[PDB]
Amino acid sequence: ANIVGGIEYSINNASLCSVGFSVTRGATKGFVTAGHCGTVNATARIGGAVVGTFAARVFPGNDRAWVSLTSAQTLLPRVANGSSFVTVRGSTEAAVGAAVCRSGRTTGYQCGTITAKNVTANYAEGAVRGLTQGNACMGRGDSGGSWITSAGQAQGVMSGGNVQSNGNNCGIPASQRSSLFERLQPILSQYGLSLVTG
């Protein structure tokens, strides 16, 4: 499969999440995603074909993971934007007030601004600390997807937020949305990963 930020993948033929970013670990290919999407060794599939397994994860506390892929996968430095693509150029962290977009299988590509950093989410499973908050809308299924600036600087992966009864926060005003992402920097250093760029 071609690995691009924002596309759907399923875990153990049950749950769905979105791909965050293609990365490598020495000769190993992989993608970063949300830790809540799977447990170590869970199997990831893309379009019904097995692509790899969860190699590590932390959730709750943090919300991060990486899936190591088979050699046959094609890593690309891109994030889906409709039928088009945003090129990944690096991981400079943007500051509060910067515009940012996110990509995932349920709401597609959405943009907004970063409104706060170091936010705690109280999920049923336990607290997740140190998340950054944006006001781009998102929905059930978008987890693990990419957060990126139009300039191509990767910010983190989709964690959670105030989903309404219709499964997203897209029908409430930007001012009332809390969409939270796990910072990419600590994920790359924690696992020794390098981002694929173009």
């Binding site: 989410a121 999920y123 499973e125 998102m138 929905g139 987890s143 989709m158 959670g160 937020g161």
Partner: peptide, 4 residues
């Protein structure tokens, strides 16, 4: 808040 909920994960996703």
């Amino acid at each position: 808040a909920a994960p996703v």
